[PDB]
Design an enzyme around this catalytic site. Structure first.
Site, PDB file in Angstrom:
ATOM      1  N   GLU A  83      58.637  75.733  18.056  1.00  0.00           N
ATOM      2  CA  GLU A  83      59.759  75.376  18.937  1.00  0.00           C
ATOM      3  C   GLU A  83      59.276  75.198  20.367  1.00  0.00           C
ATOM      4  OE1 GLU A  83      62.741  78.521  17.309  1.00  0.00           O
ATOM      5  OE2 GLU A  83      63.907  76.960  18.302  1.00  0.00           O
ATOM      6  N   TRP A 115      39.118  75.310   6.351  1.00  0.00           N
ATOM      7  CA  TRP A 115      37.685  75.576   6.161  1.00  0.00           C
ATOM      8  C   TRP A 115      37.380  76.180   4.793  1.00  0.00           C
ATOM      9  CZ3 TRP A 115      40.409  76.172  10.580  1.00  0.00           C
ATOM     10  CH2 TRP A 115      39.974  75.497  11.709  1.00  0.00           C
ATOM     11  N   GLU A 169      37.278  64.285  11.067  1.00  0.00           N
ATOM     12  CA  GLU A 169      35.891  64.746  10.821  1.00  0.00           C
ATOM     13  C   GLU A 169      35.554  64.784   9.341  1.00  0.00           C
ATOM     14  OE1 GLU A 169      35.602  68.447  13.007  1.00  0.00           O
ATOM     15  OE2 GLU A 169      36.110  67.439  14.914  1.00  0.00           O
ATOM     16  N   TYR A 245      30.957  66.505  20.032  1.00  0.00           N
ATOM     17  CA  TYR A 245      30.488  67.685  20.759  1.00  0.00           C
ATOM     18  C   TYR A 245      28.964  67.711  20.782  1.00  0.00           C
ATOM     19  CZ  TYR A 245      35.238  69.535  19.993  1.00  0.00           C
ATOM     20  OH  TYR A 245      36.599  69.748  19.953  1.00  0.00           O
ATOM     21  N   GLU A 286      37.708  64.069  20.515  1.00  0.00           N
ATOM     22  CA  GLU A 286      37.325  65.469  20.783  1.00  0.00           C
ATOM     23  C   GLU A 286      35.934  65.519  21.355  1.00  0.00           C
ATOM     24  OE1 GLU A 286      37.739  68.586  17.904  1.00  0.00           O
ATOM     25  OE2 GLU A 286      39.461  67.633  16.868  1.00  0.00           O
ATOM     26  N   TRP A 321      38.671  70.270  23.923  1.00  0.00           N
ATOM     27  CA  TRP A 321      39.370  71.241  23.054  1.00  0.00           C
ATOM     28  C   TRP A 321      39.965  72.398  23.862  1.00  0.00           C
ATOM     29  CZ3 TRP A 321      41.444  69.524  19.022  1.00  0.00           C
ATOM     30  CH2 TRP A 321      41.922  70.354  18.008  1.00  0.00           C
ATOM     31  N   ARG A 322      40.559  73.334  23.143  1.00  0.00           N
ATOM     32  CA  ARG A 322      41.492  74.315  23.726  1.00  0.00           C
ATOM     33  C   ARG A 322      40.803  75.428  24.485  1.00  0.00           C
ATOM     34  NH1 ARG A 322      43.068  78.751  20.373  1.00  0.00           N
ATOM     35  NH2 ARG A 322      41.389  79.215  18.906  1.00  0.00           N
TER      36      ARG A 322
HETATM   37  O1  LIG Z   1      35.907  78.574  17.256  1.00  0.00           O
HETATM   38  C1  LIG Z   1      34.821  78.028  17.973  1.00  0.00           C
HETATM   39  C2  LIG Z   1      34.330  76.763  17.272  1.00  0.00           C
HETATM   40  O2  LIG Z   1      34.016  75.789  18.246  1.00  0.00           O
HETATM   41  C3  LIG Z   1      33.674  74.521  17.716  1.00  0.00           C
HETATM   42  O3  LIG Z   1      34.682  73.865  16.991  1.00  0.00           O
HETATM   43  C4  LIG Z   1      35.359  73.194  18.034  1.00  0.00           C
HETATM   44  C5  LIG Z   1      36.462  72.367  17.362  1.00  0.00           C
HETATM   45  O4  LIG Z   1      35.822  71.280  16.717  1.00  0.00           O
HETATM   46  C6  LIG Z   1      36.444  70.557  15.666  1.00  0.00           C
HETATM   47  O5  LIG Z   1      35.896  70.881  14.321  1.00  0.00           O
HETATM   48  C7  LIG Z   1      34.570  71.492  14.205  1.00  0.00           C
HETATM   49  C8  LIG Z   1      34.418  72.257  12.870  1.00  0.00           C
HETATM   50  O6  LIG Z   1      35.132  73.481  12.892  1.00  0.00           O
HETATM   51  C9  LIG Z   1      32.983  72.508  12.323  1.00  0.00           C
HETATM   52  O7  LIG Z   1      32.682  73.889  12.329  1.00  0.00           O
HETATM   53  C10 LIG Z   1      31.818  71.692  12.912  1.00  0.00           C
HETATM   54  O8  LIG Z   1      30.590  72.460  12.975  1.00  0.00           O
HETATM   55  C11 LIG Z   1      29.458  71.638  12.657  1.00  0.00           C
HETATM   56  C12 LIG Z   1      28.888  70.878  13.870  1.00  0.00           C
HETATM   57  O9  LIG Z   1      29.705  69.788  14.242  1.00  0.00           O
HETATM   58  C13 LIG Z   1      27.497  70.315  13.582  1.00  0.00           C
HETATM   59  O10 LIG Z   1      27.546  69.299  12.597  1.00  0.00           O
HETATM   60  C14 LIG Z   1      26.573  71.398  13.071  1.00  0.00           C
HETATM   61  O11 LIG Z   1      25.319  70.802  12.811  1.00  0.00           O
HETATM   62  O12 LIG Z   1      27.129  71.932  11.883  1.00  0.00           O
HETATM   63  C15 LIG Z   1      28.390  72.569  12.058  1.00  0.00           C
HETATM   64  C16 LIG Z   1      28.866  73.134  10.714  1.00  0.00           C
HETATM   65  O13 LIG Z   1      28.279  74.400  10.467  1.00  0.00           O
HETATM   66  O14 LIG Z   1      32.152  71.227  14.190  1.00  0.00           O
HETATM   67  C17 LIG Z   1      33.380  70.518  14.227  1.00  0.00           C
HETATM   68  C18 LIG Z   1      33.309  69.700  15.499  1.00  0.00           C
HETATM   69  O15 LIG Z   1      33.077  70.612  16.544  1.00  0.00           O
HETATM   70  C19 LIG Z   1      37.988  70.786  15.896  1.00  0.00           C
HETATM   71  O16 LIG Z   1      39.010  69.926  15.307  1.00  0.00           O
HETATM   72  C20 LIG Z   1      38.278  72.257  15.585  1.00  0.00           C
HETATM   73  O17 LIG Z   1      38.226  72.409  14.162  1.00  0.00           O
HETATM   74  C21 LIG Z   1      37.285  73.173  16.338  1.00  0.00           C
HETATM   75  O18 LIG Z   1      37.890  74.230  17.084  1.00  0.00           O
HETATM   76  C22 LIG Z   1      38.712  75.077  16.273  1.00  0.00           C
HETATM   77  O19 LIG Z   1      40.037  74.617  16.257  1.00  0.00           O
HETATM   78  C23 LIG Z   1      40.906  75.387  15.439  1.00  0.00           C
HETATM   79  C24 LIG Z   1      42.272  74.708  15.436  1.00  0.00           C
HETATM   80  O20 LIG Z   1      42.832  74.654  16.745  1.00  0.00           O
HETATM   81  C25 LIG Z   1      41.001  76.835  15.927  1.00  0.00           C
HETATM   82  O21 LIG Z   1      41.767  77.583  15.003  1.00  0.00           O
HETATM   83  C26 LIG Z   1      39.593  77.409  16.090  1.00  0.00           C
HETATM   84  O22 LIG Z   1      39.580  78.683  16.721  1.00  0.00           O
HETATM   85  C27 LIG Z   1      38.726  76.457  16.895  1.00  0.00           C
HETATM   86  O23 LIG Z   1      39.253  76.332  18.208  1.00  0.00           O
HETATM   87  C28 LIG Z   1      32.444  74.632  16.811  1.00  0.00           C
HETATM   88  O24 LIG Z   1      32.236  73.442  16.078  1.00  0.00           O
HETATM   89  C29 LIG Z   1      32.594  75.763  15.786  1.00  0.00           C
HETATM   90  O25 LIG Z   1      31.361  75.989  15.124  1.00  0.00           O
HETATM   91  C30 LIG Z   1      33.108  77.058  16.409  1.00  0.00           C
HETATM   92  O26 LIG Z   1      32.073  77.590  17.199  1.00  0.00           O
END
Ligand SMILES: OC[C@H]1O[C@H](OC[C@H]2O[C@@H](O[C@H]3[C@H](O)[C@H](O)[C@H](O[C@H]4[C@H](O)[C@H](O)[C@H](O)O[C@@H]4CO)O[C@@H]3CO)[C@@H](O)[C@@H](O)[C@@H]2O[C@@H]2O[C@H](CO)[C@@H](O)[C@H](O)[C@@H]2O)[C@H](O)[C@@H](O)[C@H]1O
Ligand code: NA
Ligand code: NA
Length: 367
Positions: A83, A115, A169, A245, A286, A321-322
């Site tokens: 809301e 995930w 992604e 990123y 992003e 991001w956030r």
């Molecule tokens: O919580 C901290 C996180 O920060 C980063 O994620 C940021 C943001 O990115 C988007 O998706 C992520 C995804 O979660 C993967 O883990 C991915 O990791 C891979 C790398 O890109 C790279 O390829 C590496 O070689 O291998 C990794 C896999 O092991 O990264 C992508 C892109 O960054 C995005 O849409 C979100 O999913 C993510 O942030 C989260 O958002 C959700 C929803 O709001 C929240 O609930 C979470 O708390 C996060 O804010 C980073 O990629 C992560 O590893 C992690 O540190």
């Protein structure tokens, strides 16, 4: 000149796309996820943003996230009340800002989050046993969107346009809709159904559809092929997006800063070339440096490489991001500064750039 896939899009939605198409050559809109919901050091205020606290201005683009909506939750996966989210969307839009929404859909098979890699796409698509679930899930967004509407004196209904960015992604293997967990053809089926259902069955007219592979899983020697893995077709996409990123200092990237800068430019150049060929608009949907550990991140690692190449520069917007709330989440995660953060002054410079637009200097996008 680009045309939306919704030929019947609302006047405001059509205007947004047209105006993004115009402004992209010389400008870049700045976006931030969950910008009004909380910051690193605050939560509760109904009209605040870390971004504004630093610069005096709201972001031009506001990102929001629906994960959990589909389960009937009161709040999303990061405890953002739905809301309040509706209120914040309406507020940002009322000021002339742009709205974009992603969706970390929970795994329907297990009840786990995005995930949880338990396969689900094959079951969700038309003909699949859980197809009713996909419809029910999408219905929750239809209902959410209704909560964004107003009705004018003439009895006409109006909505904020939304850049809807689902199933993101997908070339990564981290989400259940990703490579390794869903076939390419099934992913395409999922995407196409999403568009048919929302645009054609449910007749939503306020959506712009954004496609967003992750750069980290694209081979730079073969960018287009990697980018177009799971691409559903031009009839299903409005924004040629990219999550990157990687080239902005990701901890796991061993490339030198100089190599990274070059890769960022190259990625965006190629993204724009694809968009141009398809009659679409490109965006960096992003990005960011978690915890903003890089000196002069904004000007040196983001703006500089974008502005270095006139193709790369033709992206319409860039969203970071956030700014996770520390008190609540127990760890540091943020992509925009807050007052006193090391990169705050450089962020002010980024804001100040004639190229970069925040909410305060947006032209009227909806006329
Ligand atoms: O919580 C901290 C996180 O920060 C980063 O994620 C940021 C943001 O990115 C988007 O998706 C992520 C995804 O979660 C993967 O883990 C991915 O990791 C891979 C790398 O890109 C790279 O390829 C590496 O070689 O291998 C990794 C896999 O092991 O990264 C992508 C892109 O960054 C995005 O849409 C979100 O999913 C993510 O942030 C989260 O958002 C959700 C929803 O709001 C929240 O609930 C979470 O708390 C996060 O804010 C980073 O990629 C992560 O590893 C992690 O540190
Ligand atoms: Na631009
Ligand atoms: Na500016």
């Amino acid at each position: 000149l680009p045309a939306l896939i919704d030929t019947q899009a609302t006047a405001e939605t059509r205007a947004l796309y047209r105006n993004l198409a115009k402004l992209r050559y010389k400008h870049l809109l700045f976006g931030h996820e969950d910008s009004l919901a909380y910051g690193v050091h605050w939560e509760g205020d109904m009209d605040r943003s870390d971004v504004r606290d630093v610069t005096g201005a709201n972001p031009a683009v506001y990102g929001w996230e629906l994960g959990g909506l589909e389960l009937g939750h009161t709040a999303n996966l990061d405890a953002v009340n739905f809301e309040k989210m509706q209120h914040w969307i309406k507020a940002g839009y009322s000021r002339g800002g742009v709205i974009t929404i992603s969706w970390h859909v929970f795994n329907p098979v297990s009840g786990g989050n995005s995930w949880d890699k338990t396969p689900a796409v094959h079951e969700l698509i038309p003909g699949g046993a859980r197809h009713a679930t996909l419809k029910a899930y999408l219905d929750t967004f239809v209902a959410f969107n209704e909560g964004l509407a107003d009705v004018d004196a003439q009895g006409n209904k109006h909505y904020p346009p939304i850049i809807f960015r689902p199933w993101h992604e997908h070339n990564g293997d981290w989400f259940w809709w990703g490579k390794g967990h869903a076939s390419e053809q099934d992913y395409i089926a999922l995407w196409r159904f999403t568009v048919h259902y929302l645009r054609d069955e449910k007749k939503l007219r306020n959506l712009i559809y954004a496609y967003s592979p992750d750069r980290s899983r694209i081979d730079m020697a073969n960018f287009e092929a990697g980018y177009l893995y799971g691409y559903p077709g031009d009839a299903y996409v409005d924004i040629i997006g990219l999550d990157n990123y990687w080239d902005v200092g990701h901890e796991a990237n061993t490339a030198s800063a100089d190599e990274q800068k070059a890769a960022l430019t190259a990625s965006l150049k190629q993204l724009v070339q694809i968009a141009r060929s398809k009659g679409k608009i490109a965006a960096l949907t992003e990005t960011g440096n978690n915890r903003l550990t890089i000196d002069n991140f904004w000007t040196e690692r983001l703006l500089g490489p974008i502005s270095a190449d006139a193709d790369a520069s033709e992206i319409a917007y860039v969203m970071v991001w956030r700014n996770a709330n520390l008190a609540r989440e127990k760890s540091e995660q943020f992509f925009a500064p807050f007052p006193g953060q090391a990169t705050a002054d450089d962020f002010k410079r980024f804001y100040q750039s004639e190229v970069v637009l925040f909410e305060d200097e947006l032209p009227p996008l909806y006329r």
